[PDB]
Design an enzyme around this catalytic site. Sequence first.
Site, PDB file in Angstrom:
ATOM      1  CG  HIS B 316      -1.864   1.132   1.302  1.00 26.07           C
ATOM      2  ND1 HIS B 316      -1.786   2.104   2.278  1.00 26.07           N
ATOM      3  CD2 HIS B 316      -2.912   1.474   0.515  1.00 26.07           C
ATOM      4  CE1 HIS B 316      -2.745   2.993   2.089  1.00 26.07           C
ATOM      5  NE2 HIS B 316      -3.442   2.633   1.026  1.00 26.07           N
ATOM      6  CG  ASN B 317      -0.402   5.123  -0.213  1.00 24.66           C
ATOM      7  OD1 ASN B 317      -1.044   4.831  -1.225  1.00 24.66           O
ATOM      8  ND2 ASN B 317      -0.844   5.991   0.688  1.00 24.66           N
ATOM      9  CD  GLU B 346      -2.385   2.659  -3.407  1.00 28.42           C
ATOM     10  OE1 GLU B 346      -2.195   1.963  -2.391  1.00 28.42           O
ATOM     11  OE2 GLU B 346      -3.279   3.533  -3.461  1.00 28.42           O
ATOM     12  CG  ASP B 348      -1.120   7.156  -4.343  1.00 26.74           C
ATOM     13  OD1 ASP B 348      -1.379   6.004  -4.740  1.00 26.74           O
ATOM     14  OD2 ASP B 348      -1.234   7.498  -3.148  1.00 26.74           O
ATOM     15  CG  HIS B 363      -0.206  10.696   1.156  1.00 31.74           C
ATOM     16  ND1 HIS B 363      -0.670  11.440   2.218  1.00 31.74           N
ATOM     17  CD2 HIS B 363      -0.925   9.550   1.153  1.00 31.74           C
ATOM     18  CE1 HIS B 363      -1.626  10.768   2.836  1.00 31.74           C
ATOM     19  NE2 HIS B 363      -1.800   9.619   2.210  1.00 31.74           N
ATOM     20  CD  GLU B 397      -4.884   7.093  -4.776  1.00 33.29           C
ATOM     21  OE1 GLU B 397      -4.485   6.246  -3.945  1.00 33.29           O
ATOM     22  OE2 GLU B 397      -4.934   8.317  -4.533  1.00 33.29           O
TER      23      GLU B 397
HETATM   24  O1  LIG Z   1      -3.751   5.829  -0.628  1.00 29.76           O
HETATM   25  P1  LIG Z   1      -4.708   6.598   0.251  1.00 29.76           P
HETATM   26  O2  LIG Z   1      -4.228   7.993   0.583  1.00 29.76           O
HETATM   27  O3  LIG Z   1      -5.221   5.803   1.428  1.00 29.76           O
HETATM   28  O4  LIG Z   1      -6.019   6.845  -0.665  1.00 29.76           O
HETATM   29  C1  LIG Z   1      -7.116   5.926  -0.753  1.00 29.76           C
HETATM   30  C2  LIG Z   1      -6.561   4.562  -1.186  1.00 29.76           C
HETATM   31  O5  LIG Z   1      -5.385   4.702  -1.997  1.00 29.76           O
HETATM   32  C3  LIG Z   1      -7.587   3.771  -1.968  1.00 29.76           C
HETATM   33  O6  LIG Z   1      -7.062   2.488  -2.338  1.00 29.76           O
HETATM   34  C4  LIG Z   1      -7.993   4.596  -3.174  1.00 29.76           C
HETATM   35  O7  LIG Z   1      -8.584   3.760  -4.162  1.00 29.76           O
HETATM   36  P2  LIG Z   1      -7.671   3.056  -5.290  1.00 29.76           P
HETATM   37  O8  LIG Z   1      -6.259   3.047  -4.742  1.00 29.76           O
HETATM   38  O9  LIG Z   1      -8.294   1.680  -5.408  1.00 29.76           O
HETATM   39  O10 LIG Z   1      -7.841   3.965  -6.489  1.00 29.76           O
HETATM   40  C5  LIG Z   1      -8.936   5.674  -2.670  1.00 29.76           C
HETATM   41  O11 LIG Z   1      -9.406   6.467  -3.769  1.00 29.76           O
HETATM   42  P3  LIG Z   1     -10.706   6.131  -4.680  1.00 29.76           P
HETATM   43  O12 LIG Z   1     -11.418   4.986  -4.001  1.00 29.76           O
HETATM   44  O13 LIG Z   1     -11.491   7.419  -4.674  1.00 29.76           O
HETATM   45  O14 LIG Z   1     -10.131   5.785  -6.033  1.00 29.76           O
HETATM   46  C6  LIG Z   1      -8.214   6.563  -1.643  1.00 29.76           C
HETATM   47  O15 LIG Z   1      -9.217   7.095  -0.770  1.00 29.76           O
HETATM   48 CA   LIG Z   2      -2.571   5.638  -2.777  1.00 27.41          CA
END
Ligand SMILES: O=P(O)(O)O[C@@H]1[C@H](O)[C@H](O)[C@@H](OP(=O)(O)O)[C@H](OP(=O)(O)O)[C@H]1O
Ligand SMILES: [Ca+2]
Lengths: 317, 747
Positions: B316-317, B346, B348, B363, B397
């Site tokens: 994750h991230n 992941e 972003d 982020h 993302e």
């Molecule tokens: O990484 P963070 O800061 O926790 O951000 C969230 C996380 O990455 C989720 O997995 C992501 O969906 P995806 O990664 O599956 O796109 C979602 O956006 P979304 O559900 O609006 O796309 C974010 O709220």
């Molecule tokens: Ca992310």
Amino acid sequence: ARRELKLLLLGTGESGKSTFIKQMRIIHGSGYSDEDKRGFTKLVYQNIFTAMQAMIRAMDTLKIPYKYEHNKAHAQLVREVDVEKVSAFENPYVDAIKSLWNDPGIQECYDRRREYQLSDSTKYYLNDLDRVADPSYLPTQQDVLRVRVPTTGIIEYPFDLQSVIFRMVDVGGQRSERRKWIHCFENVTSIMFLVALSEYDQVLVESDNENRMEESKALFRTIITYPWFQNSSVILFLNKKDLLEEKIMYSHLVDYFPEYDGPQRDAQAAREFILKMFVDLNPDSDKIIYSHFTCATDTENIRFVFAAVKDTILQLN
Amino acid sequence: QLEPPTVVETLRRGSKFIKWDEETSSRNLVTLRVDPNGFFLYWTGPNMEVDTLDISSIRDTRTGRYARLPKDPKIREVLGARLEEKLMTVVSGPDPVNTVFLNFMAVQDDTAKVWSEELFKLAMNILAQNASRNTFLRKAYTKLKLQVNQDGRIPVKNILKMFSADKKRVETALESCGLKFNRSESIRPDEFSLEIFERFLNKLCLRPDIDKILLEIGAKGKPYLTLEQLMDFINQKQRDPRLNEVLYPPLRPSQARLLIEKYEPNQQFLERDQMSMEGFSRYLGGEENGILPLEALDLSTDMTQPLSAYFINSSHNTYLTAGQLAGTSSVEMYRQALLWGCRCVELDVWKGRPPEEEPFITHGFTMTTEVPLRDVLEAIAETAFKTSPYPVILSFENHVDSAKQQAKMAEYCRSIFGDALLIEPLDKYPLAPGVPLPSPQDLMGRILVKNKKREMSTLVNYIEPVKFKSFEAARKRNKCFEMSSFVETKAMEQLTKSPMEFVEYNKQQLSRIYPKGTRVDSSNYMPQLFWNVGCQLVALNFQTLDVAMQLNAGVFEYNGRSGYLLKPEFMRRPDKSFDPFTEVIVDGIVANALRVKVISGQFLSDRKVGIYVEVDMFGLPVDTRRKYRTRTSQGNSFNPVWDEEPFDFPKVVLPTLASLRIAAFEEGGKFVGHRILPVSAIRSGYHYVCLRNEANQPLCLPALLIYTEASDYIPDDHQDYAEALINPIKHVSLMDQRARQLAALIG
Ligand SMILES: O=P(O)(O)O[C@@H]1[C@H](O)[C@H](O)[C@@H](OP(=O)(O)O)[C@H](OP(=O)(O)O)[C@H]1O
Ligand SMILES: [Ca+2]
Ligand SMILES: Nc1nc2c(ncn2[C@@H]2O[C@H](COP(=O)(O)OP(=O)(O)O)[C@@H](O)[C@H]2O)c(=O)[nH]1
Ligand code: ALF
Ligand SMILES: [Mg+2]
């Protein structure tokens, strides 16, 4: 309204359960394409190597000389093989095994297979090496029926017959394996016990002193008297009857089961004595038992014998 | 075939290398070497001082472009496409975050590629990381003999530093071997024999626990353990009782001999087929007597089942290095993740700027740093299949909204990753309903993109996100390529409400999971929660190595660290179905029982202190118990021996899902080491458990002796029946004796 009935296959080691499940797969199930056959080509090779290694070791144990000396070398080549690592089947190993199979010395050892451990359908392969050694050998369906792959775990197979779906549970027949059997003793409509008719003159793999048929017997007599199967039908397949046909000519039943005083060298007399040992005079089982003489490698014999048993089961449901 | 670690001649012969530094700007022409066993990389530099690097700590070896250049001009002059074609760089450290770089310039041509390629092979080698207890002692020995003073000798302050757990009791051990015991002196490699390093360890660390085990086997006559006693011990105690005698046969007599010939100090016993105490003690830490089988650590899982059937290691991230709101964003992590056997990372992505026009990863506009996409895509293209030939799932993302920058993003992917990027679907697997998801085998060495679809949507196929409605609606549409990502607490709501509907979803479709936003220090949830319901892409924070992440990278080691573990039978079969909260055993699923008694430990700490050990189980809710503990030991960390009752785990419902966690802790709560053992593959008997650090690297000296009994379940009531099936001949013979006796009385 599609009924599902649960059938257990039980039995001692190497009685033929997993050979039966294949027949079920050929008759009712999906059957074997060429791609399915090819999957076993490896397993065929490994069976031949396992065969001859086990025969070579016997030559040492039983102290039988190799008639021709140039076959002493061949024996050393093969014995040093790791059989799990067998993928192909090429020279010098092909001619090594041929030259050995021709050796009057090691043919003596094959006749005394009774005294050591040599899986059945060893002779089926080695008499047909040239076909198997060939650089483009696709296994025949009998080659897939003969192949020996020890079974461990508890594998549930479903089968779509017209009227009903059978969930046939395959299991292991070694001593250790029966401690797992309790995890398939629920909602059982019937049992299908497999006894190997050939194993009257044989001792278990897992116990060297004890006779395979005393085990298969005692196991069956005990198991039918268990609370789980108080409302389950008991089909008894006496398998490997073709092997008896050959073996009873030389290995005399009287010598391993003294209660037998029917004629010698009689296939029919011998098999019907056995039948009685399993079913008759059992105080804890007074349910009916439905016997059947079978040959799991012989496909027609199984289509007939089972397309009967289908009735016998449904009829009680 | 799993080969053992083998150093090629060149690496013992040596090769000339110039060590150089980014920061302080240094230089020594050193000759690099590896010892024959392949434990240590070592070089002799600053005025004859031998400096060593532990190969089990090595994380990557890079040459050419990927070998970092010295961007300073003064260093660049001292050294000089050819010039970088002989640059080497060794990355290491105890986890992804806190790495250390070491650079080298090969003086002679193209030897850097030979050297880089071989150090990687030795570092990853599986046989090495799960070496025998005895080999890990040879490690410690081989360290001493490497680390020497200017005039070759072995300083005695090392030998006291190494075993600094009772320095006044060390003193007396050495003198008895005829060696130097005073701090100010040294020892000749001439006469620091392995034979003599062994004898030293015996006098130092006495084994009352093993004296127990010998008479406990049975030998009133204490001097000798005969051939059969050994063979009976090995078969009737060291063998796993859940195994087939045809597939895994028992030890023969001629075989049992060879273990006496192998591990023997005393020839009086060898000639007459017996065994000494130090030959038995040698066997316990032996190559045969391991806790797990190579079968388990090997890559021998069935790898032709559909994608939806495998647990996938997931980050994750990935870019983040510690905190979620403030801190670095690193390209280093994308290597350190994929190098660690991760298969889902992941990215972003956010829109660029007016002056330039390049997308960057960061982020959610908080207070973290940026990194250029271009480089991250090439960081991933380098490490993708460097430790695993099985596919990678890039978790885009995407927040970039400009068809100019969106098209470069699709071009970057197609050029950088190249043909690895899965651009369109295969022959066998068209994108239609009823078609199963392709197997890992069928996608060897492919990059799978996960982005929203209707230029970047051109790349998307088998992993396509959709706004999850319900499991009902997801079965209504019935398409395996469609999948859903669930935030922690949203996936948690499904678990208490519709856990059975979930296992069925995961039998066909993928389902990703990630941690909630309140965990701003990148805290990790327990991934077993969702693994239990067949969730594949359970994503975690790799920057944090807490009990959750210690588990993750621990279980994923198995199947040759490919990052793919196969879900159980019943969580893959469509015709079958069960409940994850079953407080009772399941039909068709052979349950297990477990015993774990902690006997003792060896060389656990570098100081005197009490120690305790935790034994926990991780699986289905009913399987999971995690509060067993030893009592903090007497107070010496040399050879503590716990005198305790076995920790019981009698009813393990689904045993392929259960993982045991033995972990050692200092009086106070500091971590010493742990090990993740899978319950299905563990062995029974007296076994050493060589410990590991949090990132699952093998700590060398510390180890525990523990007694395991891993048997099959039998409900108490049905024990009688069970035992008659195993040995019926004895059961029937007994009844015949009764009928026989009452024969005369009835008539
Ligand atoms: O990484 P963070 O800061 O926790 O951000 C969230 C996380 O990455 C989720 O997995 C992501 O969906 P995806 O990664 O599956 O796109 C979602 O956006 P979304 O559900 O609006 O796309 C974010 O709220
Ligand atoms: Ca992310
Ligand atoms: N000749 C002959 N061989 C058989 C017969 N039944 C089984 N075999 C062979 O004996 C072996 C045992 O088969 P298997 O189903 O694995 O027995 P299980 O271990 O009880 O399942 C196989 O290699 C078969 O080829 C039979 O009726 N006749
Ligand atoms: F007893 Al088996 F395969 F069922 F050897
Ligand atoms: Mg079988």
